[PDB]
Each structure stands twice: as C-alpha cells, then as structure tokens.
Paper text:
The remaining 59% of particles were SNARE-substrate free and grouped into three classes with split D1 and D2 rings; presumably, this is a post-disassembly, substrate-released state, and it is not observed under non-hydrolyzing conditions. The particles show a population shift towards a flatter D1 ring that is closer to D2 relative to the non-hydrolyzing class. This is particularly clear in the case of the SNARE-substrate free classes, which also show an expanded pore. Finally, substrate-free classes are always ADP bound, even in protomer E; they are flat, have some N-domains packed between the D1 and D2 rings, and are characterized by a split in both the D1 and D2 rings between protomers A and F (right column); this is consistent with a SNARE substrate side-loading mechanism proposed for the NSF ortholog in yeast, Sec1845. In the absence of a completely protomer F-rebound state in the hydrolyzing condition, however, we cannot distinguish between SNARE substrate rebinding before or after protomer E hydrolysis; the former case (ATP in fully rebound F and E) represents a classical “hand-over-hand” mechanism, while the latter case (ATP in fully rebound F, ATP ADP•Pi in E), a ratchet mechanism in which F re-engages substrate during or immediately following a translocation event driven by protomer E hydrolysis, locking in substrate translocation. The flattened D1 rings of the SNARE-substrate-free classes with ADP•Pi in protomers E are suggestive of the latter; flattening upon hydrolysis at protomer E could exert a pulling force on the substrate, and translocation would then take place with substrate engagement by a new protomer F and release of the old protomer A. Multiple rounds of translocation are expected to ultimately lead to melting of the engaged SNARE domain and subsequent disruption of the SNARE complex.
Residue numbers in the entry:
A (entry chain C): 212 to 740
B (entry chain B): 0 to 161, 169 to 291, 297 to 335, 347 to 424
C (entry chain D): 425 to 740
The structure:
Amino acid sequence: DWNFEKMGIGGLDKEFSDIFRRAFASRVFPPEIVEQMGCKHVKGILLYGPPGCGKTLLARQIGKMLNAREPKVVNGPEILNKYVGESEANIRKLFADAEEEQRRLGANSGLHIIIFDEIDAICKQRGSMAGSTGVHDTVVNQLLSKIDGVEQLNNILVIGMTNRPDLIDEALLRPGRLEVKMEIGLPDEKGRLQILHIHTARMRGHQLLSADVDIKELAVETKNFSGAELEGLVRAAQSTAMNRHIKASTKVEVDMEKAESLQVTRGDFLASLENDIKPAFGTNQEDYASYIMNGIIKWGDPVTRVLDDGELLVQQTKNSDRTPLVSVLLEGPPHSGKTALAAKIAEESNFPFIKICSPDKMIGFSETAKCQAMKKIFDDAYKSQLSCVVVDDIERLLDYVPIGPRFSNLVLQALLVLLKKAPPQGRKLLIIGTTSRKDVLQEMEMLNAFSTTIHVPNIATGEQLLEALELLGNFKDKERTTIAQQVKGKKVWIGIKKLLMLIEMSLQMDPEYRVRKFLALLREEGASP
Amino acid sequence: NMAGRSMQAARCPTDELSLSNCAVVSEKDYQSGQHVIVRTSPNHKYIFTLRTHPSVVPGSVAFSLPQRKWAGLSIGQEIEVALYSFDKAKQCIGTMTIEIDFLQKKNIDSNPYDTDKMAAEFIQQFNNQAFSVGQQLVFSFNDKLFGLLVKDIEAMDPSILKRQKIEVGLVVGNSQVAFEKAENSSLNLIGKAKTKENRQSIINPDWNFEKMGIGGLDKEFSDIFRRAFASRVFPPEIVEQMGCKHVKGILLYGPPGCGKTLLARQIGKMLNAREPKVVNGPEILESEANIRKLFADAEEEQRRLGANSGLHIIIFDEIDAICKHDTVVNQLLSKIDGVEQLNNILVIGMTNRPDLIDEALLRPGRLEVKMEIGLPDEKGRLQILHIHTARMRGHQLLSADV
Amino acid sequence: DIKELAVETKNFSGAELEGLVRAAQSTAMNRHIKASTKVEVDMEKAESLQVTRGDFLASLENDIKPAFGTNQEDYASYIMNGIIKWGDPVTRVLDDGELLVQQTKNSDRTPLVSVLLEGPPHSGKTALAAKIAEESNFPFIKICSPDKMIGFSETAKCQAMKKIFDDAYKSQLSCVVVDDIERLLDYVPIGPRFSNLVLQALLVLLKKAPPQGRKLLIIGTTSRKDVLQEMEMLNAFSTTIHVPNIATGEQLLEALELLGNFKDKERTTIAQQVKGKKVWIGIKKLLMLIEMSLQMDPEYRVRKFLALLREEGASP
Ligand SMILES: Nc1ncnc2c1ncn2[C@@H]1O[C@H](COP(=O)(O)OP(=O)(O)OP(=O)(O)O)[C@@H](O)[C@H]1O
Ligand SMILES: Nc1ncnc2c1ncn2[C@@H]1O[C@H](COP(=O)(O)OP(=O)(O)OP(=O)(O)O)[C@@H](O)[C@H]1O
Ligand SMILES: Nc1ncnc2c1ncn2[C@@H]1O[C@H](COP(=O)(O)OP(=O)(O)O)[C@@H](O)[C@H]1O
Ligand SMILES: Nc1ncnc2c1ncn2[C@@H]1O[C@H](COP(=O)(O)OP(=O)(O)O)[C@@H](O)[C@H]1O
Ligand SMILES: [Mg+2]
Ligand SMILES: [Mg+2]
C-alpha cells in the first residue's frame, strides 16, 4: 500500500510498486528470518527512458525512504578522465567508505547508494559496431570486479540511469550483476493533473492563487509535455504575475500601494503557454510556417480529390486496430506544387506529434551521418500514442544524378527497412513522402513498400487557367477577355509554381504592354505534354 | 426543391445583391426569404439565404465572390440545391461574434468606428438570414467595405412568456453582435457592443530608455528583465511564501557589435548590485584552478551572509570555444548544477555561433533563456544617433544644416 | 513439488534457478509487509511465512527470462492477425511444414534439414514461418531479422550472423529462422550491387553440420527466386515450397466471410460482380483495401471497394 502521492512522485504508480517488491522487500524484514530463509540482497537496478520524466526524484526518494546515507554522484563521460591509470583510480575512490564501514561494524552497516549517470558511455563497445567510430573498453572490467567477485560487499547498491537502452553491453545484465530493469515514460492524462496538483500546493495553502483557475483545462490543453516543463510553466506564470506589480522607473524597488493581493490569474497561465515554454516531444510551429507560403487555392477537381483522400487516410490510422502503420506516396511533374499539399494534410490532422525531416537541414553531410540523423528522427516518433512524419525529395537524400547512375546504397537500404517496421505496441504512425521522379523509384523496387499512391496533375485546360487567374485576382475583365481569346486551344501545360513567377515577371512592365509580354512568355515556355 | 435539384453556379448580378450576402435566384425557381442547402460533395454542404432577381436565368444560382471563395464554388459548375427549414426554437441566434477588418488595404484608415452603429446596421441588413461559423462575407458600413468572418454563434433564449453553441443559425431582429478586429489590424473600434479581445498582452513597467543609454532594444530588455530578474527585487519573504526559485542561466547570441555587453552591464548598474567580473573564453584553453578562482568571493560572501548576499554577475565571454576542454565544462556544470551550488550566482554567456553550442547545456534547470540581438532598423539607427549626438547638442556646438 | 518445477524449466542455465528461487521467496515475503510509516516491519504475520506454489508460478511467468530458451513475446510482433483458412494452399503448406518438423526429430541419418519459402510479394511468407516454428515446441527458437541491424557494416553483420548460429549448437534441438534474405545481401537491380562476404558466409553456414548428437532446422523466406537461382544459392536448400495468391471469385467470397466485415446484402452484389471474372491480389493487400473502404458512409462502402479493386486488384 505504498503511498506515493505524499512523496512528490505522481503518475509513476505501478513502476514504483514493482521496483519495490522485486528488489527491496528483503532489506526491511528483520535479519533473523532473512537468514533462516537464506536470501541474499539485490545489488543493481537499471532505469531507461526519455529525459525529464522524474527518475532522479525516484532515486532520491527511494534512497531516503529506508533511512540510509545520502547518495553519492558520478558522471559517465567524466570518469573517462585525462587518461588511463587515473581512470581506475577515480573508480577506486568511491567504495573505500563502504568497505571501511563493513569492517568496523561488520554486517550491520547502512546502505550506501551510488547513482551513476549516462552509464552507456563508460561501458560501450556496441557503438563501434555502427558505421565508423571505435574505442577500447577497460573501465567496465574494474567496475564489474568491484560490483561482484572478491572482497564483495553486502551493504551496497548501484542504480544505473540511461537515455538509450540498446547500447548497453550484455555483460552487465546477468544475474548477480544489474538484475531489475525498468522503463519510465512520458506522463499520461492523469499524470499531468497529479503533477500540477503536487507542484502547486504551497501557494494554494497560503491563499495566493485565484479562484478563476481550473487545473483540468490546463491539464487537457498540454499534450505530450514532459515532467520538468510543467514546473517551468508554473514558474513563468508566477514570474509574470510578480512582474506586473514592480512599479519602478529609477533604481528599481517594490511598490506597497499595489502589493497586497498578489494573485496569479488564468491569463498569466495562458500568456505563458504561448510564448515561454516550448515542448520537445510535440508540435513544431516553426516548420509548417515557412512551407505553405501563399496558401491553397481551389482551381479544379484534383485539389478536392487529393484533400479528400488525405482526410480518409488520416482518419483510418486513428480508428483502426489491424493496420497500425500506413504510408502514402505523392508524385507528379516538377513545379506542380506538392511539397505544400503534404504540409497542409499533416497540419489538418491535429496529431500531437508532427515533425518534418526535409533534406534542407543537411548540407554537406556524409552517407553515415545521414543514416544517423534519420534513425534519430524516426526513433523520437516511437514515444507518442500518435505520430505523423513527412519526407521531402526522396531523390535528393539518395543523390541520384543521371550520369552514372550513382547513389548511396546505404541510405536506400536503411530507408527501405524503416518503412515496414511497426511501432512497439498500441501506437499509430503515419508516413508521407514526396517525389518528382516516379520512373527511377520503380526500378529500385521501392513502390512495393508504399501501401498506396496519389497523383497531383498540372493545369491542362484553358478554363482552369482562367479560373486560377480570376481567383488570384490580378488581371481585370478587359485583359481577361483579351487573354481569354488567344488561349483557345487545349495545349496549356504549366505548373502552378511557374505561373506565379510568370505573373510577377509580367507585372513589372508598363501598363499597356503587360498582356503581350505575358502571352509571349506563355508561348516561349512551350507545352511538351 | 424539397428533395433537391441540380443547378448551375453563376455570378452575382448586382453590387447591392453582392453586399446582401444572399444567393441570387430566379423567381421561376424559388421565392425570396427561403433558405437552401447547397451540396458540392458528400462532405461539403453550405446553407444560404435566397433573394430573387429578374436577370437570373432559370437553372442557375448566382453567388458573390466572397460566397464562392467560402464555399469553394466555381462559375459554371454543377451543384445540388435543396430547401432547408430552420428549427427556430433552437437555431435562432442570440449572440454572435464576428471578426472584422478592412476589405481593401488601399482604403485603410485610423478613424474610429462605432460598433453599436455597425451592430445595428448589421441587424438591419442581415435580419432573417442564415450564418454559419467560419463564414466569410463583405459588409458595407458608412460607404466602407469590411471583411467579416463568423467566429462563434450562440442560440437565443426563450421569450419571457416561456447558452448553446451552434454551427449554423438564423439572424433575427433581437440578435446581438460582438465585433473584434483581426490580428494586427489597424481598425479602431469604439463602443460597448465589442468583443474587445486584447486580453493576451503583458503589462510592463515604464522604463526610460533614452536616459538608460539604450535605443532600439526595448522588447529584448523587457523580456529579459521579466524572465530573469523580476524575482531578486521582491523581498525574500514573499519568495519563500510562494515557493519559487531563481533562474541561473541566460544566453545571448548575435552578430558582432550590437549591444550585448551593454544590455547586461546596464542592468548590473540598476539593481545596485556588485560590479561585474568579466572573464575571457579563448585565453583559458592549471585551468581548473583558474576556473575555481572566479567564484571564491561569491562563496565567501554566501558563507558570511547565507541567504542575504547581493547578486554576483559573471559575463563569461564566447562559449563556443570552451564548450563544444571537457574538464572545464564538467566543472562549470557542477558549480551551477548539482547538489552543491551557490544561490547568489548568475551566469551570462555570449557567442556568435548558435548552432555549434552543445545541447546538454540547454535544458530546463540549466541555461533556460535564449535571445537574439540582430542589426538595428531605421528606428534604432535614429535613436542611436540621437543618443550619441546629445553632448554636442547641449554646448551649442552643432550646425542647423545637419 | 520439485519434480514439476524441474520438468517445466528447459534450457535453464545454472544461475537462473537461484534467480527463480530468490524471486519466489521475495514475492511470498512481500505479502507480510504492512508498514507505511517509515517501513520497519509487520507483526501479526511475521509467523506463518511460507512460499506456496502460486508465487513460484507467478515468478516463472513474469520475472525470469532465460537466455537459451523460447521467447514468446517476440512472436506478438509477427503473427499479428492470426491465420485464416481461405484455400487449399494453407492446408498444404501447414502439412508439409509439420512433416518437415517431424523429420528433424525422429531421424538418425539427417541431423540437418533446411527449407525455403518463396512467392509473390504481399502473399504472407513470414506469418506462416512464424506459425510453423511456434508449433514445434522446440526449446530454442530464435528469429534473425534485418530490422535489428539498421545501419550496420559488413563485418558487424557477419559477426551477428555467426554469433546467432553459434548459440544453436549448444542446445539439444533448435529452430533458427531467417526472413527477407534479399534485404540482408543489400540487393538493388541497378548495377547489380550486393555484398559478396555475406553471401559466402551464408552459404558456408548453410552447409555446416552441428556437433554430434544434436539437431537443427533452418527456415528462410524470399521474394525473388530467380535472382537467388543465379547466385547458385538454390542448391544449398534441401526443399522449397510455393505460396500462391487469391485467384478466383469464390476464394475471395470465402475470405470476405471469414474476416466478417461486409454483410449479406452487400455480399450479394459483390458476388454478382466478382464471380464473372478472375482476380489477382495478395492476402495482405486485401485487409488494407477493406479497411480503406470501411471509413466511408454506410451507403457507399460497396462502390469504393469495387472501384479500388479495379485499379490494383484484377491487375496482373
Ligand atoms: N493546389 C494548389 N493551388 C494553389 N496554390 C497552390 C497549390 N499547391 C501549392 N500552392 C502554392 O503554390 C506554391 C507551390 O509550390 P511549391 O512550393 O510546393 O513547389 P514544389 O512543388 O515544392 O517544388 P518542387 O517539388 O519542384 O521542389 C506555394 O506557394 C503554395 O502556396
Ligand atoms: N493465412 C494467412 N496467410 C498469410 N497472412 C495472413 C493469413 N491470415 C492472416 N494473415 C495476415 O496477413 C499478413 C500477411 O503477411 P505479412 O504482413 O507478414 O506480409 P508478407 O507478404 O509476408 O511480407 P513481405 O512483403 O515482407 O514478404 C500476416 O502478417 C497476417 O497479419
Ligand atoms: N513525476 C514527477 N512529479 C513531480 N516532479 C517531477 C516529476 N518528474 C519530473 N519532475 C521534476 O523534474 C525535476 C528533476 O528532473 P530529473 O528527473 O532529474 O530529470 P532527468 O531524470 O532527465 O535527469 C524536478 O525538479 C521535478 O520537479
Ligand atoms: N543600441 C545601442 N544604443 C546605444 N549605443 C550602442 C548600441 N549598440 C552599441 N552601442 C555602442 O557600441 C559599443 C558596442 O561595444 P560592445 O557592447 O563591447 O559590443 P559587443 O558587446 O557586441 O562586443 C558600446 O560602446 C555602445 O555604447
Ligand atoms: Mg519540394
Ligand atoms: Mg516479408
């Protein structure tokens, strides 16, 4: 019946109980019955999860529960100090106290917790088994010898914490060594409510907070928020509320005339939520702001059809239980304006996680760093109950230059393995990709990995051109009629992007020459259907 | 009509009917005042109010440009039209909120507009007409054209003899209109019948920049003061009362020579704090003893006075060179972060390369403030020239030609 | 009773038994703690402490994971939607798999047996290997797949392969599975390009015999038979099987019923249309189409399905 609401930890209910029952119940019962039953004590635990989820709080709380020595601390990449020799002397200067206390007090001393950090750095040879890198391992041997072997202790306990669980050498996950291994994940809906209650109790007892505040609304308006960021918010709101009453113009100083009813108000919680804090595992509002520049204009049927199909796809991945992963490929002739439809489709979903992976942020990378960046971006998407990812120019990641041909086979072999992998469990992912060449992606056998495909056409009739011109609204009825006469003939092959450039180029001339210039430019561009 | 019939979209015949926001139809087909639902697809239906005009050819519905843009209609396309009956017991509009802005950017002005008069005119013009959330239209008031977008609609209350949100409703005589200007709009709205939605704003203490010695950096200064120093001015008793803490990190990056050092030194000479202690970055690259030498005064002062010592400011210079060596980074992080840390230390870092900076150094608890100081615009240059040419303006030593 | 627990623990190394005993004792010894105020000890049950079979079983189910033993959880990610009998080929393939399984267990002159599954893409050539392996009851059942080695180099892949095959010689029986061979060699039709080292390692491993007194079984899957026949890999596999696709109206009208989504009124029209024609569609694509069409309105779920079937389906 361990009660964790008082301690400060909220949301992490089952994990705490499990980590207590499995590896701690044998340090509370009296020594006599423990000896009679003949049981030893666990001397290792491993914790893995994303940062800012409340792990070091759990460690300190469990350490302080049993009334033991306050913990020590170390850093992983630090103990790899100046060089070797001292690398095994720094390790030595941690356990002397425990051995001395054992000898002095026998087998009745107190627990001496040791909290490592970034343990996957000091103990790593799996990283050498990836494109490039490579490094020797020696310190793990000394650490293993100290943990178990000769002169072993019965009053020690090691707790390892890591951000990546797949680069830990197997030698440390065997019985006798680190045994119990647990996962700490992002809080769910109830966790945010409990954390907000725990973090805003001091100012609700001394009668500071206002009555127009509703915790439930603030909980429901924050999605995929880590643990620490709620604290950051609740702090920034108070900062603004305190700032409002700092009446000073010279040599600062507080004002008592206004100071008295200092009350954080819902506004100070809303203004904080729009400018101050920015989640990491969440929406990105500076990525869909510079892609759909000129908006979307309905110039025919294809736009409506494409949008309807996008809506159907985005609603299938949310209300299904037999197809957790779906994908769709968009294709068309160049300058047809398809990198904007993908962003519009994604932004309309309202999924918690929406992250673009354009090739515009990787200028000069080598074939290995590309693989690394793509794997990291995809890995971040396995930590939410809903995800949408977008890939732009699937032929500038591969570097397909017609002469040769040439390309990076490694990137292709990574990409054609990622698009067929389901998330861990009960999590829904959607992948959208864009491309212009659909006759070089068929030869590589890529089209059999995409579950469907859509076609974005060009403007191919005079009526559509006239409708687009009217909707943009630049040429008036006179020029429209004039331009509506020479264009008789269904041989207008032109992309939407090119049309804006042509209009802007034409507008620069004198008022009476614009129509002739535009017609000449349209004729010179050609058709080549 | 009741079952629905196919019809051809057409253009609005007259400007007055275009401003009426009503679908213009032929007398041979429908009657004025009737409401219709127009279907363009299974998922696209829009409700309109009808008005008859002799010039409409039977077999075509005329729509204005705002209506076509809102409903995605094209002249000459085929639509379905079916008569629609409102449930006046539920769909009558009691209060609706409208975003309003100038329709034409060429006719924008700063003159006031009385939202009570515009509300009355809106009721007079659009009474007994259907309106849906998100609908776009054009409204003529005092011979001025405005773009209106429907934001929210609420149902009417029952009559005295006898607040639900609705997507589509019917405007009646006693309906109420609340108007709000668009984001960044220069429209000046006056009166009481205003939604008046400007709540999301910050009240800031009134600084005197010209005497302060800085010009063209008002917003950055205000934000930094609000986020990093507003807590060390209130008496500590209130800080303990509320249960807050003190920020411990600020990062300012920008092109060389924009006012980075000044923006911190000036604040240093405003809290009556101790004079800063500048250190250089590339020179220190025994370094650990040098790094330890810096904070000794802060440690001694904290030990002597505990939680009563004045703030100590550090203006640690370019940080990309040192932090990306590792020993210095670890020592600094231990000093600022960890079990053993001082509560009277504030670190300010400056640099030119923002991308090269490590990521671990930027996390909540660690450096938690970032700002960008760019080149000044015309206003900044004007203010800078005025401040830098004030000494000569007092002695009577400047010509009138300049 | 020690006998039952001893028999129901297979390929358990020495330490794991001590781990099991400790876990059982801990679980039985947690029910007697009732101290929620600084936790010291609970009386009134400090006596009556026992270790009953229930805790042994619970610990064996959730708390111990052997290294040289079966891994049940893995299969939850391959055999997702079960197996549905839609035609004769399913029964044929399962029967042949069962005979192969019962040849590598009651034989003295054939310690090694290898089989290859192949067929057109999207015909379900993996969720049948997983189902065949899971019914062997063999102590050691691994699965080597290319998605756990993303971004590796040649030498790393060779080491991983040699190591997985080197943990199957230490058990009295085994069944190792390899899937999507063409994605391990890094094959791409342009060129062509591939890794010679991995091919040589795979061949030499496929033609190795384990130490005396032990038996093995290898099951592989592929989607391009001809390419493999070019590299002469087809001579190292003892036998091969063919996995077909749905090609007839009735075998589609049967699958649509067994899945159980469309109803009688709609089924009648679907039959009326499909029966008078031939079809060509893999099993996997059918689920994706059926759940593509279920998202429309109730009165249009029959037309979109057919329209979709007229572009990808019936498209040889
Ligand atoms: N369907 C559409 N109707 C009207 N305007 C559109 C449409 N799609 C995109 N646009 C607009 O036109 C431009 C579309 O061009 P876009 O930026 O997508 O080029 P692109 O397709 O990315 O080029 P490429 O794929 O060759 O690199 C954008 O300004 C966008 O606002
Ligand atoms: N009798 C069945 N045969 C095949 N698949 C079935 C059967 N019953 C249900 N299924 C479902 O159909 C899926 C088809 O197999 P799967 O999804 O593994 O693709 P595949 O065609 O084998 O793969 P690949 O293209 O990599 O060769 C099975 O995973 C399972 O989800
Ligand atoms: N479940 C939680 N309840 C209350 N506070 C939490 C929780 N999780 C994280 N925090 C906050 O996070 C901070 C500690 O972060 P920490 O867990 O050390 O991050 P990391 O584990 O990534 O090092 C504390 O100030 C604490 O208030
Ligand atoms: N916005 C400004 N207003 C007034 N003076 C300025 C402004 N920006 C720069 N200056 C002047 O220019 C000089 C800039 O020097 P410094 O602050 O050391 O530049 P940096 O910090 O970018 O190296 C200062 O002496 C300051 O008086
Ligand atoms: Mg593009
Ligand atoms: Mg397969």
